[PDB]
Automatic annotation (TrEMBL), chain A:
Residues 24-113 form the IraD/Gp25-like domain. This is IraD/Gp25-like domain-containing protein. It comes from the Bacteria. It comes from Streptomyces coelicolor (strain ATCC BAA-471 / A3(2) / M145).
From TrEMBL, chain B:
This is Uncharacterized protein. It comes from Streptomyces coelicolor (strain ATCC BAA-471 / A3(2) / M145).
From TrEMBL, chain C:
Residues 101-254 form the Tail sheath protein subtilisin-like domain. InterPro entries: Beta_sandwich_Seath, Phage_sheath_subtilisin, Tail_sheath_C, Tail_sheath_structural. Pfam families: Phage_sheath_1, Phage_sheath_1C, Phage_sheath_domII. It comes from Streptomyces coelicolor (strain ATCC BAA-471 / A3(2) / M145). Residues 255-351 form the Tail sheath protein C-terminal domain. It comes from the Bacteria. This is Phage tail sheath family protein. Belongs to the myoviridae tail sheath protein family.
From TrEMBL, chain D:
It comes from Streptomyces coelicolor (strain ATCC BAA-471 / A3(2) / M145). NCBIfam families: tail_TIGR02242 (TIGR02242). This is Secreted protein. InterPro entries: Tail_protein_I, Unchr_phage_tail-like.
Amino acid sequence: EQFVGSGWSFPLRIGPTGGIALVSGEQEVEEAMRLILATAPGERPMRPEFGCAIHDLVFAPVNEQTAGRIQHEVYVTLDRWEPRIEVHDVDVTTGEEQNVLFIDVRYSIRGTNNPRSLVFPF
Amino acid sequence: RRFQQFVDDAKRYIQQRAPEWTDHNVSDPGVTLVETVAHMADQIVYRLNRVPDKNHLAFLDLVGITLFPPSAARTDVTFWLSAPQEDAILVPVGTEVATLRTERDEAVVFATEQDLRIVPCTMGRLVTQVSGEAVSDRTTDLAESKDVLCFAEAPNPGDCMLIGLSAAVPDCALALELDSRVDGVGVDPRQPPLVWEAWTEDGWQSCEVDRDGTGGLNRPGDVVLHIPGGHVLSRNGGHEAGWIRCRVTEPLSGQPFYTTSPTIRSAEAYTIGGTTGSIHAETVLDEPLGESTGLPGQRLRLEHAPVVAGEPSVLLQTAADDGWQDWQVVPHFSGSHPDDHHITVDATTGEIAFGPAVREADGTLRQYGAVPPKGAVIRARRYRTGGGRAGNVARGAVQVLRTSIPYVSEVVNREAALGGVDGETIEEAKLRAPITLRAQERAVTLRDYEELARRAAPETARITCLEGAENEYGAHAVRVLVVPQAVPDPGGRLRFEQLVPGDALLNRITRHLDERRLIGTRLAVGPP
Amino acid sequence: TSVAAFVGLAPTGPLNEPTLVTNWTQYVAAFGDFTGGYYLAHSVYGFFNNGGSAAYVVRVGGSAQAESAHPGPAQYLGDSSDRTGFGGLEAIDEISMVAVPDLMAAYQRGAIDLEAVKAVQLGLIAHCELMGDRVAIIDPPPNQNARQIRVWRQETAGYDSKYAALYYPWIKSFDPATGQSRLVPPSGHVAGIWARNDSERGVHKAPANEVVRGAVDLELQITRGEQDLLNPIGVNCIRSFPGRGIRVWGARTLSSDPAWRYLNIRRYFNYLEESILIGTQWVVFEPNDHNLWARIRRNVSAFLVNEWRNGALFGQSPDQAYYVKCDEETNPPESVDLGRVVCEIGIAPVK
Amino acid sequence: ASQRGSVDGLGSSLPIASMLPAVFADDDLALRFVAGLDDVLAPILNVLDCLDTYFDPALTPADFAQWLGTWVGAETDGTEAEPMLRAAVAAAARLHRVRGTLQGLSETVRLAFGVAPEITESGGATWNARPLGPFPGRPRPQLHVALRLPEPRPVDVHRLDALVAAARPAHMPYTVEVT
């Protein structure tokens, strides 16, 4: 229902006929999320507050206390800078051994309300 | 500008309750609903004020404006094969090659324009040759081994190597083996800039190189060449085969030749592939469109690219008791009788018109073109898409051939698409009308006469038109003075020969200005 | 309770191994996306779009014997090899619903005769009738036309089983990649509705009158008068109600038994039966005597009463809800091993 | 007047019954009565549809054909035959783009009679690289029109005389010859 627009993908490429690729629809929102979460709240001095501040929660003890702060860190950032999306919960899990923290954000563009989970395809 | 307004909103139509007729004193949920379900007038009125986009297309025909038809792109599709065994028609005309299919909608798909045939071409005669040494009826220079001298161990312009080609099929690829006994200093294959040839019936023709073992044969090489048209070698001997020529060009400063070229020992020719140009096209079958309302003027749209021009490529099948009724496409409706079955199609878009009704005076409802009965199913049997800009495919992108009808594989083009042009939209043509409708085209006054020449010859530095004065023949004709461009040397002096214009330049001006001249006026050109 | 099973052709990925997927991106990482025009890719997408966080897919065919008894539209039991045909689903004990998307792409492409595709559906029904918990969704011939589908159900197939659901008109779904309407069977989409139900209103409510979101248009629109010659016989329908989108109308199972007509009752019982047998796991343990038979009765009763707590039972009070009997009368002294029998009840049907 | 009244046996793209609610559609007299009102709105919807054809000179009724001739320089005076008018209006806009040229005079007389003319004029085109080279061309103006008509009734001369009067650019004399 919400308009999604169009813009170039994160890994930009020549395309079928040359020039520059261009992608819209449900795929585009995923690319914007990939940019927003990956970058630290820096490296972009003109826009400092942009970029999810996740590095402050590295090397914490494995507790739901730090697993809860990250749960709220994503919410503010995923909402402030990406308004064309509605966020449906995050899931912090130690899916391999017990020394890593995986986040599984589930989102759904407004009105379309089809649930999807961001995957970070490498 | 000053457009009348034709809107009277929906509610005002229910306003006429008019309870002043006997006894109909009732409210909303009565079965007086026909007072409201005739709100279609609101839908009708809104349709009046809107002037349809299709209307612009009508009066571009009225004022003599031709819409822009879309084109397509032509490429150089090259086949490949690994089992050269015989000759037959391995490529039916219209064989379809396709690009890779990924998340970018649907891959663009081409279609060959001709029929391609493979031939396992063998050799003819290997002959010794050097500059100034013709064949002189020599054939067996390598028929029984003993090697053959390569340019007398001295390659200079005019040299060539002589080998026959059994068939010389115009659109195939030849694989020549060059087993050379290595002698002297080894060299990079690219270093000697040798040029191939074929001795076409029109004369010598060039060829390209796609393998390292072509020149500078430090090791026995395997030349691969795509045949540039059909040819036959200069028959003096015992082999009427095709022709090859390892002509060596001038010695470049950075690309020099070398003495003591290696001596050829064994050689053999094979066919590996064939190259044929193709146009961006496709053939879709069984595209149902829905059901007909049985009313005149129905319009149907195809959810694909513009239909490519050619033989009638939009076959409309209509359900009937006897089966399928086929509609033949026609040009502009004109005199189409009610009995006849006819349709109108748009080249640049999927809009497909149908029989338009018209209520003439006395209400004859003179209908042009038949109308399908209500409930009939309409489907498109044949449909040839392909036109548009989205055929400007990048170099070497097409990699899969459709339906894999023969035993062929690895179909990869070498050169990028020529590039088609997308047809103009109605909105784009709405901007063309104010300009191209008033582009002079009369040549009345002096300004036009000098201006029109400039349009015909944009490269002219100075043009001016002076009328022939009185006491001069030619029926008050005019003279045109033309000054061709020229750089007057670094020395500051200009030769007189540079001032005269070329004959073609003068002819080009005259040919164009002859058509747009007014009645009974003569023009002559030339320097003052 | 909601996880689904799908059998169809899909490019790449493991062959005949019932992998588990939970998100659409997980699917595309294994078996492509819409490539080749296989119906399984569209059907899963409609299921994922229509709610339902779990899904099992059994890839059998491949990109191109593209279609046959076992390869393609899989029908063989696989000789209980746990790796072939519908036998792959046998070693799951979690899947609660099965569907056959590709089963009839062969019919459109002509690679399978109509009499050949009747047996495989019946083979699927024999699978549901065996495991005793899952429910299969059946799909009719494309472009069947309303007056002819009623003949088809009662003459060609005539399944008459308590584990099959039929949904007549197909769906013109929308492919986001190309934005082109395509025709697909409603097996995947309807299964999405059944997944919403449990996760939004419980198994109690029959899966009907819910938006078939993901849909755009319906071929062969059915009017109400024509429906009343279809609904009682045991065929559902999908209609385009004005201003309310596309909704599923009818919740009748493919059975002629008057006591098992409605879908939710069969949906309820499979949930109900699977709940207790997971609970009362006193088997190959706890000596069969007059003591255990009393223990079983209390354990079952303490659950059904709690089931009446959430509604989904009738009686105004627990005493009038169920009726259990596991005393010495039901277990004769002769039943040395084949013992520990009991009875139970549950009912709350729909409109 | 034109008697552009209603037409019997014509359907509508917007049936009045198809907009009715459900249950209301179950009646018999209401369904037939409300369908009767379609007889009054039947041709209006046909009119709003296919309006493009109502503006193409090759298809549009005779009345608008003359009216459409007003949009451009049709000059439809004296033509009492419908088929003759059909070509004139559509081809009028292309004439004025080259009006006054050799092809324009030839085509206009071709349009008015259906046969190509034979014309000779005091003019031409030439080119020569000789500096200040003389230019040929008839020393005195002259325009001649010849028509190879199969049935020369003794009225075409005046018609050719009248028609060629506007084609000539008010510059040179003329004469009319008809087979």
